[PDB]
Structures are given as structure tokens and as C-alpha cells.
Amino acid sequence: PVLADSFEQEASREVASKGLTNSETLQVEQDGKVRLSHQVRHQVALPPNYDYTPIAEHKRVNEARTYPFTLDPFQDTAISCIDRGESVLVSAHTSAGKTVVAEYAIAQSLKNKQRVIYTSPIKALSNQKYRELLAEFGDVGLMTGDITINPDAGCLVMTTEILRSMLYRGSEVMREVAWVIFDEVHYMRDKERGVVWEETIILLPDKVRYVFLSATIPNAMEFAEWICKIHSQPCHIVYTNFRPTPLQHYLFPAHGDGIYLVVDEKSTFREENFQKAMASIAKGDIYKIVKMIWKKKYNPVIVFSFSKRDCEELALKMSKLDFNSDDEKEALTKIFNNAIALLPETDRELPQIKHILPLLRRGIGIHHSGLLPILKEVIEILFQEGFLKVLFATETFSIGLNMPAKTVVFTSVRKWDGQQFRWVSGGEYIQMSGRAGRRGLDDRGIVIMMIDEKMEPQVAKGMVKGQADRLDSAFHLGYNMILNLMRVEGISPEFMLEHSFFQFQNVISVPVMEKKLAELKKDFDGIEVEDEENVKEYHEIEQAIKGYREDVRQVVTHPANALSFLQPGRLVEISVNGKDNYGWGAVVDFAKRINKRNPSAVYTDHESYIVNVVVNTMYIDSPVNLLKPFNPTLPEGIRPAEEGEKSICAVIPITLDSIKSIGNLRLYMPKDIRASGQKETVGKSLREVNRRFPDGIPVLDPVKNMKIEDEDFLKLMKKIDVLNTKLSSNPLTNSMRLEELYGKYSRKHDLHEDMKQLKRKISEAVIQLDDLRRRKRVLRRLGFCTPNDIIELKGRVACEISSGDELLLTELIFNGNFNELKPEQAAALLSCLAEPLKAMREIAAKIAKIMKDSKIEVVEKDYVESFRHELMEVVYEWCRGTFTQICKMTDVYEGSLIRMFKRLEELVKELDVATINSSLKEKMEAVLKLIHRDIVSAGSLY
Template structure:
């Protein structure tokens, strides 16, 4: 056990702020007062290196023990590696453009790999899988020949050995899971099938019930046949059963984890790790995953923690080959960029980008460019004709390439696109009648008021036309109805968000991306290859389509490398998202034979972290050897010269930062002003300003005080192969400076104000229209003439006399640069002919030194196990709040917190023990609890009556007290952020529902989508059940009855309508 006051002190030093941004009222507060002698600074670096070295050698006792425990676990052996390459010939059919994608007479032979490896514990009597003899009476037979990867995976199961199957969507992974279930049922064993989402669990329950009969379902809100031999459940339910010591677990022989790549999810991924670690070693596993590049690493982890073999079977087999097209916004058609043989068509790609340039304008100075007034709707085009999405869908329908799934990254965009298509009708009379019948049956269980909900009434006309919408804001019953209609072929076009690509087996012939950029909560970025693979994998129905078609709509330029990386790139790695929680720590302290330290030892996070240590050590050895090989005669002299130059560079950068502050620089960013630009460490030399504007970028609350971002359009001399494109932040990519006069290619480049290195006195008169290449070359010739006239030394603006920077600290900074430059001139090496070579050699040595220091920090971090320090801090919090004793024995508060996993366990437990709920009515209690399960962003702030605002204040006061205790225990918790995560925006909605309001009435009280409301109520019911269990654990029957009555109040009507799959 840990001593409360022992600390690792791994990160004991403080870092100083950089001189990055300068505000109007505080230009220079942190200028260094004294210039350190070079030898003193170098000595300090050596001391830092020594300290780092000591940290690597002299470790805390607990950490040392932790390391020993991890090291004692035997390292798995990777064996039985083989690859099979299989090829097949497919028909050379006409593509979406009406002609074959390969030359006439050319055969299309597609090959795919099946790769096998196994991680085996040392001394395990492993028999190569090629020597496996299938049983005479297999657990399950199929009316078709199994694909090679399926045969290998089934052989692993027959040998009673775990297997990870990594394959594309629709490749046939479910066959492997079905075989494991059939084998368990044949051997009278129990099997658990886990899935990441309830909708997928419901769907699998239905499938397996039809197939196997003896199947149960456990998803928290629904429990059916819990004593069945095959249990379908969510991963959270399995985790809960493991912590509770459920009798069922003792009978389980196999566990199937569907969509195991979900383990990398930042919020829920930890649940997968917990459950895998806590399952008994005797259990065997089937892991089904999308393609992941580090599958073997995962198999080695399973082998190490459970001391059993774990096979990986990987295939890039795709039953239906895909063709990938680009559709440039406002363009005249589609362009095949990757064919079914996975060849990238560079010429077609460039044609698509050229079509985009023609439609949108390539030059910021041109009339078609995107400026303040040039906003475009990706559904529109440049000629005010039909929207692009309308044109694409119409083309797909005419060429019979439906059904089509159209992926968008926002719910509102899905609905807007569906409305654009609402005048078209893709269903005949009999199909419309079938839609009516399915729809009527689906809503037959709802009351009359719920049937009249706007969402239900508005969807039916669209569905009758063969058009559907699928996103998280839909009512669950509507989502399921749409899924059923899509599976039955009654929907020809489905507008969906990314979640539709997860789990549900609903392929289409064509997939369309309305954009290949998405906002991920932090920034707008290109879709990753893993995301693209997951969504595009919905294209092509096995056995029905010769080809699957993917169309990417693009409304801005992209580099060929970006497109290749997206379409042909590697899928996302499965990295651990393990993180500690108070609920986990308390549960582990209660379970015999395990502990929080045990969980940290065994988790995938530690396994991956430890894998980096040998690599860091090898890199360190190489760098140290390289540094030692650089011997410089008179190193002391060049080191002092080097330090002086570095000081000048630092202060010069500080001066430039002040000069470029918008307050001082914007008045001089007039058209024609000559400026020198350095962008991405490339010197573009002198250019002429054309325009300057403020960038209206999305800001987070934490950025309120940050300096506004300005973009300056500058005429710069670029290389002939330069192509102006933009990255996620709107910065130019694909540009390089010209290397000589022969390849002069002046372009108008929009760059950040911060890329300007120097501002000159000179202003030129430039033509207003610089769209033609000849006009740009003539304008740039004027710049060259100015440069020639001043012999390359173009006069610069004086920051004090011309730009009016009068701050005394700025003058002090300028004086320091002058003093340093004098010291450089007086230095003995200044006049030495060897100075250039000496300086370059010493700079290289210093760069290696920095790399070594960086590696040492990484090594210290890797060896310290940051989460072990966090565990100690969290344990302190639990002791301070009275959840555990000083010897880590769980107290009554801790036992209550163990029952709560759907809300903040510390805050809810404190509220119970403070008697907050005792004085509240049932309706008030349920309303307060809604703050713990609602996590969406809402623009309007909640306006609450006193009966709700009073308990909210009590809750917030308790949250602040917890945050203060956490910070005293070194948890570095942002108090306002912590309190702000409990959102009161739906308190009045929930309160009204508890008092008997209709669903249509509460929908009018908020802008939150109906589907999101229902999700909140269902999570709320789950939390109320946990609160009942918490009250029961301390014998508070009055509180238990209050929460139980809360469940009765919310459990009604459409919110808890039964799933269509059950």
C-alpha cells in the first residue's frame, strides 16, 4: 500500500512561459533582466541532465515494486506467422461514368491477403494451426465455402484458443462469432456476446434468437431470459457483473467482443479494458474488429495478462470491390480517383481539383474566391442551379446505383439534404403501401398524442418517397423503423451521420460523403483513413453488387497525399484510452484478489507504455554516440559565441512579436507594402501586401483573451510546381519558394500575420486585378527592381520612430540586442575564417543535445507511470472525503459510491450523506439528477423556478467543495469546469415530465432533439436504479422508495417504447 505523503516528484521543475503573444496593456513584462553567461547556462543544462539521470536510476520504492511486478509477467512469444495471398477475377463492368474502369480486354484480378500470427505464453505446448485436424462433428456447418480467414479463425476456436479477427465491414466476421456460440451450446457451456451500443445488442439478440433459440438479453433497461446459455449484453453490463461477483461469470467459457476497436474510445474504452482484465484466465475470447494495424500488440497483451494463446487473423479481403470518386463542388461531374484494383488515378484527381478551381476561383484576389461574402453551401453550386447533392442523387438513381447512404457530420445537414430531395419520389405504389404498413405497425404501440409528434408526422411523407434520415436526434422508434425499411429495400436514399457506420449490418450500393472534413470538438480536420474506411465500408452489398461506389464531395482543394492517405491509408491504431475513476478504485478495493495497482499493472495502457522504453533507450544510445563523435577544437570559445547568437535570436523574435501585434502592424498592412515572409521554415523573400482581413474562427471559452488572427494576402514568388491548397486551419499548403529566376511563379498566398519577418518602408502601386499570370509576373518584376535598387538591403520600418512603439520595456529590449551585437563583434571568433564551419558543427551538436534531453524526459515519463501518481492522488481524495480509511478499507460512503457508475459518484454520494435529497420531492430529486446525465451543448441558459434553482445551488456548492479537496490532493481540477459539467438545462423539462406533461409539450420547452431527450430519460432511469441500490446499501428505505417512485414517474409513453427488435 502507498504511504499518503510519499511523492514521486518526477516533474519537479517549473517551465517558463514563452514570449508568444503581446497584449495592448501588457506589452513586455517578462523580459529577462540579466543575460546569463554561456558557461552558467550550460552548467545548468548539465545539472538538469544529471537530475534526469538520477530519476531514471533512483526510483520510488512503490514504483520499483510496480516495475518488478510488471517485469515478472512472462513475455509472450510470437509464433506461427504465415501469409496466404488469394486472388480472384472479377468482371470488367461499366463504372458509374458508363464505361469500364480498365482497358477493354484487360482482366481485373483482385488479390487479398490472409495473415496469421499467434502470441503464445513461454513453455506452452503449441501445435501449428496448419496441423489442426477439424472435428468429425463440427459445431456448425455452412451452406457456402468459408473464406480462408474464416477457416483459420474457426480452427482456433475448435482448438479452444482465443482469436482476434481483424477485417473490413461485410467481410464475414460474424461467421466466426456464430461458430464460437454454436460450439458453446454444443458443449453445454455459457457464452457472452458483448456489443458497444444497445441498438446493436437488440439487433444481435433478434438474429441469434432466430438462429440458436437459447439466447438472453441484458442491456440495463431490458432484461430477457437472463439464464440463457448465450447472453447478449453491453460491455458496461459485463463490467458490472464482474465487480458484483455474478454467479453467471463462473459458468462462462467464451466471451465475444464485437467492435473491439471501440476500446480506443476516450470515454468508454476503459470499460473494455476493465472487463477483459477482470475475466478469469480460463475464459476464451473472440475479438471482432475493423482492420487495425497493431493487432499483434493487442494479442500479445491478452496472452500476457491471461497466460493463454491468442491468434490474430487479419485480412484485407473486401467481398465487393470499391470504386472511389471525387465530385468537386459546382463542378460538372465525377472523377474516378481510386479504382477497384486500388490504383490511385493521379490524372483524374488533378482534373477534379482543376474543376474545383474553375468553379470556386483559385486566386484570393479573384471574384470567385471565398471571402467574407463568398460563403457557399455545399449543397449549392456556382450557377444557382440545383444543389450538388440533388444532382448527385439524381445521377445515382438514373444509373441504378441505389440504395445510397449519404454521410454528413451534422444532424441538421442530414435533415436539410433530405428536404432538398423531398420533391423526388423513388418508390412505386406497392413500395409506398409497404412503407405505410411498416410505419403503422411500428407506431401502433404509441398513444394518440405521441403519434401526432411533428417528427413522426414529418418523416412519413419522406419515407413514402424512399428517402430516410438516421441520426442520434431521432426518436429511437423512428430510427429502428428506418433501419427496418432500409434493410427491406424500401428506402433508396438514406441521409445519415457517422454513427450509422458502427456495428449495424446495413450495406448499400453507394456511399456519398457530403464533406471529407469534420469538426471533432476541437478543430475542423480531414477525415482520418480509419473513419473513411469505416464509413466507405458500407458501400457494396455482398452477393448483390458487382462494385461498391464511394463518392466524396469536396468544396476545397486537397493535396494528392491527403486523398491517398484517406482512401488508401492505414486504419487507425488501437491505442489504450485507459483512465482511472473513483468508482473503479473503490470497486477494486472491495474485490478480493485484485487492487487498483493490479489494474494499472495489467492494463493495455501500461503494456503499450512499456513497449516504448527499449526503443527510447536505443535511440538515446545512438544519439549519445553521435554527439560524442563530434569533437570541436576550442569548443569553449564557439560555445560562448553560439550562446550570444541564440540570445540575439531570442530577443529579436521578441521584438518581432511586439511589432507584429495588430495594434502596431495593421496600420502598415496597406496594399503595395513590401514585406519579407518566412512560412513553414521556408524563406519566400520579399513580397507585396494585397489585402489584410480578420479571420472569423470558432473560439473556445478559454480563448477569450487571445489575440485575433489576421490573414494577409501577399504576392510571393513560388516554385512552378506550387499548388495553393489549405489545411484544416485555413493555412496554405503545397507551396514552395522559387529557387531561381527561371522558375519564377508569383502567386497570391493568404498567410498569417505572424509569418511576416520584416516590414519595409517601401509601398508599390499594384494592379487591382492579379488573376492572370502575366499581370502577377509584371507586378513581381517591380519588387525585384526595388530589391536591385537597394542592393538587396530594402529599408525597414523603425519600430520606435515609424511604428510608434514607445513602451520603455521595448526600448530596453532593443538596447539588449544592441549590447549583444557589440559583444558578438568583440568576440575573438568573429573575424576567424573558420567561424562558419565551427558554428555549423556546434549547432548540429546542440541540436543532438536537445534531442537527448527530450528523449530523457520521455523516458522518465514512460518509466514513472503517470497514472500511478494519479492513483495516489485519487486515493488521498477518497480518504479526505471519508470514502476509505487510511489503510484503504472501503467505508460506508465508499460502498454507496460503488453502486453509482452513470453519474459523478463522489458528488452524488456526498449529496446523499448531506441529506440533500431528504428535503426534496420526488419530482425535484429526479430533476436534479438530470444534471448528471445530460452532456450536450445548449445555447440558451436554463431559467429555473426557485423550487429547482435552490437544490441546484446546493449541488453546485457541494461540487465546489469536492473540487477544492481534489486540488488540495494535487488533482489539478479546474473548479469552474468541474461544476459546469453538471448541466441544468433540462431540469425544468424533466420536472414537467414527472408531473405528467405530454412528450409533445416538453419538446416545445427545449431546442434539444427528441432522440437526445429520450436518451437522457433512459440514462436517467439507469441512474435512478443505481441511486435505489445506493440507498438500499445503507438501509435508507425512505430514500430508496423516493428514487423508485422517480422511476415510475418517468417510465411511460414514447420515452420507454419497446424496441422493434425485441
């Protein structure tokens, strides 16, 4: 395919505000308004020799849909693609200003008595768009699993999954369908729902036209080419950095009194205001800012926290304040109780609505991942109406609601993940902050970023003036899809892979690699070194030496030997993960690693113990306030200081792989921790000891000190002497150029091994094929036949898609006909004293030996513990019947229930797809009755 018709256009709007500062933010226009611009870029991907007319030159004859306001060029061009009948992709921020474009496509379809599909990811947003489209268009139709009404329609709204099935099933409506409109296309990078999007598209007919709707996305021109490649047709892209109601961006430093406009409505980076801000460098800070905003009247606020545990402590500490808005509570309680009575009664009690309602009263709440879907949409409507003024809410919203604005306040600048404490990304920042600002209802949206760490200009420039995450494919070959590939005709797995966006992105990367591997092949074949033959043998010998003593380190540093040493004060040589030398330090303590985020986790012998060390070589700006206990993942920003930087004393966690050597020395370690100078004094002792051994600290001899006398060990040391001989005995007896000719050849060798690894990434769809090949090799040993056609067992999967592992579950059926009180062991596969949990584990490892036999991933415990015993006895007791009792048996939020209830249940119950093991199909309808009625009519529409 071919790229053409590229152009940028400028556009500018008018709004004036001083906001949260002392001065007016922008140089003012006479009206009291402010002239602000935004750019809007377009290009098209065209098929070879396609007769194209430049979209700028186009004139629409017949306005399908007509609009009251002046359209924007980001809109106006998309609409001319649609009217040229040329697929178009639009990314802009969720002003949902995109809607204008969709509305046009629809109306254009129905004007032509054609049919057109509108897909969103989620059943709910299907209803919301449905109601919206219904009110404007009439013959609209809704297809969820949940709801399905007037399908004999011309405008059909369906979940993305619906469509997937329909393309796989009878391409039925499809025949009359002109345009398919994908909302929230950026969801395709999701590791989960992200394959649905890709698959679906891939399936679709080269003859249907597309309208893609995205949030802003860096490279989307890679997306259109793909469409232009696989549905052989023109695809336009339409991007804008437009912001519906401009944003302002403050840092609130944590000593906490002054507040600094850091990025403007341009976005001009207020560099000076910033460096002022960093200079003025944590519970109560938040209250100060909470009160401040209700007082400064930037009225409703989402206070983003990254954990559930934070949103709950911080929403209640502001439940002291706005217990007012209570002449408003003289109205609130009523639509809030439009609910609790709609409940089952026993499931209407409990610490559920308890608490909550003062916060409701006090114009406040929290935001789940733990509440109830109605508990949260009452809130969402409480937020819609602004009855709640501060919701202490979490990163993650229902994918994705509509939310009140004016005020967005990050409680932080960092995110955990077990545990990197890492900076918010460019991407994360745009989404979360994207919530501040309301159309018309706000002359500006406000972003306030509680910072608490010295942070470089280019770091924050990346975070506050960054871009959104790449759309990168999330495709991969799952079984219950391979089968469906196999069965229905015309459509090979091998056709899917070659057609995936994934293999596409990979296809583009290859000329990229080539240009550099060809750029590196000029440079390795550019460095020529004298007596290369003589240098080499010398270079290799020194490297063989390098490699053996590494083997030695691995022994010493091993927990069988090391641990018996290493008392507080032990001197240790730190090179963490091999790249961060922090030199000598002293042991504070150590501990068996306790991986809490993952129960069934396995660690190396070296990675299995965590060591605390005082080092004094720590870069001074390292946010050492961030590293957590016995968690040797050192946050980005925590580095050792290099030649000519300032240092400090810190206590860091390491693994035994971070240890370069154990000294034969112990200094004094205060058991009084790092308490008020205690770690600094040790810092002075390290300074002393490091000054007392400039050359180095005497290392413990493995043999004379550590009683290490393995036969295997000694032979290693012997090899070392053997080399050290041949090496010394080399005619680079101080060759006067030894450091010059080594350096010259080492660069040659470094570039050589690097040209190898880019020679490998290069040349290799041919990557995805193996899992395909290997999944069939697994599959044939089971349910598909050996010529790769679907047999019986591949009926006991292929139709599923909601598989809690479709193959361990298909295999337990044709084997284990249990009782009634014990088969709640589906908790073991769908949640992520008398036990039949060995029947799945004896069956798994065999299945997992196959997955090992067909050369896929791993059997060993990780496949066997892939199916979790953790909450196996909890969901087990629920099979015997209170809602309030079961919640006393462990520690999982009451929102984990309506998911896993509908996730352990929806696993047991879609077995639609036409009959039979009798004893199953009956004792299991019972299995479905003993849990549904305990929280009966799930029921949740709006």
C-alpha cells in the same frame, strides 16, 4: 512471451462489370467472371516454452459446427484455434463473415456442455444477436439492463457492461464458462466505452478462452501479445483484406459532368484516370448524381454528410425527384404508421412526422442524431426494405446498424472539428465506404467521392488505399472504478495499470525509443567543433539574445498595445505558429475571438483576438476555399510556398501569436472585401511595397511610436544591449569560419536537446501511476480511508459507474437539501432568474482546489464551468411540465431529449445497491415523475 508460426496465404475469388465507366473494369475471364485475390495473414503469440503445434499442420477430428459452403482460410484457421482450444483474434471487414467463426466456438462449447458468453457493446445488438443465435442454437440467453431472459443458459448474450459488473461482482456463471466472444473489439479504442472493454478483459480468468472479433486493424499483433501476456496463453491473430462484394472508387470533380474510376478491384490505383480527374477541377452537383444513380439504377444510396445541418438541406432538394416509388408508397405508409399511433398522442403531433412522410413517400429521409430512435429504425427498416432510396445520412450510426448499399457517395473529402477542415482519414474512409456493396444483391459496391480541390496523388492514395486506425488503448483510472478496485479482493489498482493494454503499448515503445536515442547518441558524439568552449559561450549568448527579443515581441504583439494600431492596410510580418513564414502582409481587419463550439472556453491574451491578413506568399494549391471566418486553424494543405513554387493572394485568419512584426506603414484596403479582383490588386500593392523594401519594412519603434514605456520593458531592452555587447566583444570578429563553426556546433546542440527529450520519454506503467497516486490523495481526503480502504462516502460512489462526476454529486448530497422546482440543476452536470447554481460552484472550486492540491488538473473556471449553466433553465422549466413548448426555449434537437432524458434521469435514478436524507428520496421520486410521464413509456424494442 514469444512470437512464432508466422505465415501469409493467398486466396482469390470470381465474380465481370464495367460499372460506371465506358470500359470493362478488369481483364476478363472467359465465363464473364473476374478472378480477384485477397491475402490472409496469421501469427501466434506464445507463452515461454509452450508446446506448440503449427496451426497449418492441424487436423480437426470433430467438426463442432459444420457448414454448407466452402469456408475461407481466414475462417478456417480461426476455427482450428477454437478447436485447439487456443484463443484467437479475427479482424476482417464486416462481411460479418466473422460470424462463421463465432458460431463454431459456441457450438463447440455447448457440445462440451460448457457455457459461453457473447458480448456486444450495445443493448440493441444484444437483442439482434440474441434472436439470431436463439434461432440457431436454442438455449441462448439475453442480459441487458433492459432485457433479461432465461439466464440458466449455456450461451449467454450480455452487454459488455453486464459482464464488467459480473467479473467485479460474483464471478458466478464464469465458473462453467469456456469461451468468451467479444464482438466489435475495435471499439476498445473509443475514449468512452473503450475502458469497459479493456477492464473486462483484464478481469477475466487466465483459464477462460477468448474469441476476439474486429474490423480490419493495422496492428492487432500487439493485442494478442497482450492477451498472451496477461492471461498467460496462446493467442492467434487472423487478418484479411477480403472484401465481400468488391468495391469501385470514383472521383466526381465539382465542375461536375465527368466521373473517374480512381481505384480498382485489386486495389489497383488508376493513376491515369486520376490525373485526368484532377485536371477537370456546390449544391446541384449532388442532385445530378442523385438522379443519375436512380436512373443508372444503382438503386439505394447513403449520402454521407458530416453535419446534421447538411443532411436536412440535401435530402429535401432530392425530395423533388423520386416522389415516385409511389405504387410502392401504396404499401409504405402502412408499416410507417405501425408506429405514430403507438405513441403518446401529444408526443404524436408536432413537426416530427410532419415533413418526413413526403420524403418517406418520395422514397427518402434524413438520419438524425436528432430524430427519434423509432423514427430512425422505421427508417432503418425502410432502408432494410429499400422503400427509401436516398437517405441523406450522417457520419455516425447507432454503433452499429445494418445498411443497404450498392451506392455510397461522399459529399466531401474533408471533416470539420472546430475547425480543422481536415481530410477524411484512411480509417474514416474504410468504414463509411464499407457500407457500399451487398452480398449476392450486388456484383459490385460503388463509391463516389465528390471532390472539389486539387489533390496530390500520395494524399489520395493515403485516403482511398489507406488502412484503418490503430487499436490504441483508451484506459484511464476513474474513481468509481478505483474504489471497486480497492473493495473486491485480489485485484489492486496497481495490478490493473500494470495489466492494462495502455501500459502494454507504452512498454513496447521503450526499445523503439532506445534504438533511436542510441542512434542519436552516436551522432551528437560524432560532431566535434573547434574551440567548442569558445563557440559555446558565443552560441549561448546569441540564444539568450534570441530569447529576450522574443520577450520583446510578446509585448508588442500584446492586444493592449498592438490593437490600437493595426488599421486596414497596416503592414504586418506573418510567421504563423512560428513555422509558416508568409512574410509581410496587410491587415484587413480584426475581432475579439468568439469561441462558439465551447461557451466556457478560455484563451491566451494573444490567442484572444483574431487577425485577417492579406498575404501574397500562399502556396498556389492551398485549398484556401476551406478556411472559415476568424478561425486561425489553417487546414492541412494550406501552406506558404517555398523557394521555387507558385504563389497567390489570400486572406488568412491569425492570432497575435502568428505576428512577427508591425510595419510603420499602411496601404489601401478596399472595404469591398475580396470581391472580384479587389484582393488581387492589393496583391499588386504588396508586390509593389515588397519590391520597394527588399531588405524589410521599417518596423514601428515600441518607444518612439507605441508609447510603450513599462519599467519592466526597458530593463529587457537594456539586457539586450548588454548581451549585444558581450557578443560583439567576442573573438568571433568574423572568424572566417563563424558560419562554419556555429553551424557545426548548433547541430551538436540541437541533437543534444533532442537526446534530452528522448532520454525523458525513455525510462518512464510508471506513467499511469501518478493519476492513481493523485486520485487516491484526492480520494483519501474524502471517501477512502488513508490506508486506502473504502469508507462510507466511497459507498456513495463506488457502485455507480453512470456518474455525472461521482464526487461533486456525492458531496452535494451530504450538504444541500433543496426544494422541488430548483433541483432540475442536474441539467448542469448531465447536459454536455432564481438560481441555486452557486452551491455547486462554491463546492466545485473547493473540490477543484483539491484536484489542484493533489496536483491533478485544473480548478480555475474550467472545473467550475465543467458543470454547464447553458441549458440549466431549459431542463428547469421541463420540471414544471409542453414537449412542443420546451423545444421553443432554445435550440437542441429532439433526439438530444431521449438521451439526456434518459441521461439526466438515469443519473438521478439508480439509487439499486442497498437505503437513506429522506427529504431527498421522496421529493426526488417526484423529481423522477415530473419528467418521465411527459414522454411516458419510453419503450423501444425490435
